[PDB]
């Protein structure tokens, strides 16, 4: 679905829609500072190119960056996140897929209560998409990983390895 992205708050100002993933917003919008979502999760991401702090949506009207918890209002690219029936995710200690295992097909709130490691080195994303979080809870910083491999952290777009909690993109009806 369609997401129309706007320069300044509650809607106004400059505006620009798109209906798919965009690399560089930079010739439409010098800023963003709200966005309303028709259908179809976002990934928003600060940077041309997907790179950068990402911050995920899900349909609705943000009025102000700091609805989709933004720290800042430069959004550059933007990628519509395919809707899926189901979600498989593996994921594992170390680099290149070895090590501990642990295979997810649901949300995990806190991945160190169920996988003793602090740290994610590979992963395998089998079926959805799903968005990994920093630390437990839903908090820090987030990473977009939709169906594929990833054979080291940077795949992901990540500085580190550290990986707290995890949940399966998926709309609002």
Known sequence: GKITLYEDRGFQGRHYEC?????????????????????GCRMLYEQPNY?????????GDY???????????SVRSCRLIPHSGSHR????????????????????????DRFRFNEIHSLNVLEGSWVLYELSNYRGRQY???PGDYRRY????????????????????
């Open 19 to 39: 209906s798919s993933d965009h690399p560089n917003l930079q010739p439409y919008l010098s800023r963003c500072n709200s966005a309303r979502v028709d259908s």
């Open 51 to 59: 790179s950068g702090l990402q911050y995920f949506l899900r349909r």
């Open 63 to 73: 009025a102000d960056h700091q609805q989709w918890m933004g720290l800042s209002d």
């Open 89 to 112: 995710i593996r994921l594992y200690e170390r680099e290149d897929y070895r090590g501990q295992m642990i295979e997810f097909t649901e949300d995990c709130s806190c991945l160190q």
């Open 144 to 146: 977009l990983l939709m």
């Open 154 to 173: 940077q795949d992901w777009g990540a500085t580190n390895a550290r990986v707290g909690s995890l949940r399966r993109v998926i709309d609002f009806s």
